[model samples]
Target: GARASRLSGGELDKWEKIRLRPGGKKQYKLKHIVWASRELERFAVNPGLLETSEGCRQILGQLQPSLQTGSEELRSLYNTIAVLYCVHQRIDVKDTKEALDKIEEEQNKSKKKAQQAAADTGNNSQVSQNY
Candidate 1:
């Protein structure tokens, strides 16, 4: 018997023929451009795309965060992750970014089941019934 690889960053099965890979930006790069217009054009599909949290997080990798004074980039990085919260990008995920497959089905549940600490479809208590 063997354990199925998981917990993310795994599945490095040579990065080839691996089904259902992580999207947005993970485990791979989108092939950069150098001395070529086609390369540049290949990634022009979206404008301000990098401004998003997804793109912002991806671009933040430039620092690699491995080793460096982090001062030169820290100044701009503050502005970077700043802008992320600036626009409420993944708002709750400000610092609680859980995983590569981050997910949160928040603020959308309500139903009543009379019992201890009864939980409504959208709330945890209804002692006041529309109060």
Candidate 2:
């Protein structure tokens, strides 16, 4: 849904200037940037666009725990972004496999239902013929 972009070295360089906050009014703080860069190492889109609990850990690791203001905001931001990443990518192996398995299971259920319907119809026809 969002504009998906690459988060490479060039994108890292632009992190400071990128406005991660609500409006063009505010920008990501310095510590936030470093933590985000490391956390979003392999992301495909703008790292600011996604957030995860792992990203929150990186933010905490990069900054002191006592300083709660910006770090919390950064944590929350990464969590939101992570949600976006998961929904947008659908690339996680575990989730992908689980989805595929569910689809196959549903297909099998449908097939069984259809076969049962056909068998019931044939039985009804046989009963009618016998009567």
Candidate 3:
């Protein structure tokens, strides 16, 4: 015996509309990252070691793109905050920022210093200025 219950009126219409919609989306920004971290933490070789050689660092690198440029909303904020957190405990943001700036500044300073020395040598080649 085969008996079928009926979805009448609005119920039938609503069910049709529900099928039309694709997949539902997540509302949270870092939901996927959080989920991945949890999964990796559970099943990695060392377990709970996200920064180790075979851990979060490698896994998170692959996931960063999704956070930075995915269809999900809040991508920018989530990616920035999460990437910053990636090194938060191990390194200081201010120090790293300062070190990066220093590299650029020092490169320019060294180039200028070298140019000045070369010019001084050229001048001395013309006339030995040692009295």
Candidate no. 2 TM-score: 0.23
Poorest 10 consecutive residues by lDDT, candidate 3: 13-22
Best-matching candidate per lDDT: 2
In the range 88-113, model 1's lDDT, one tens digit per residue, is 35332222233222322221222122
The candidates, ranked best first by lDDT, are: 2, 3, 1
| Residue-pair clash count for candidate 1 | 7
TM-score of each: 0.25, 0.23, 0.23
- For residues 35-122, could you state the per-residue lDDT of candidate 2 as single tens digits? 5555545433335533453443343333335337545545554433432233333322123233233334535866788897897675
For model 3, name the residue pairs that clash. Answer: 50-56
lDDT of each: 0.31, 0.42, 0.37
Each candidate's clash count: 7, 7, 1
Residues 22-118, model 3: lDDT tens digits: 2432222234335434444443322234334234334444545665465443333233223323232333223323323333353586678889888
Candidate 1 deviant stretches above 4 angstroms: 1-49, 82-88, 92-131
Better of 1 and 3 by TM-score: 1
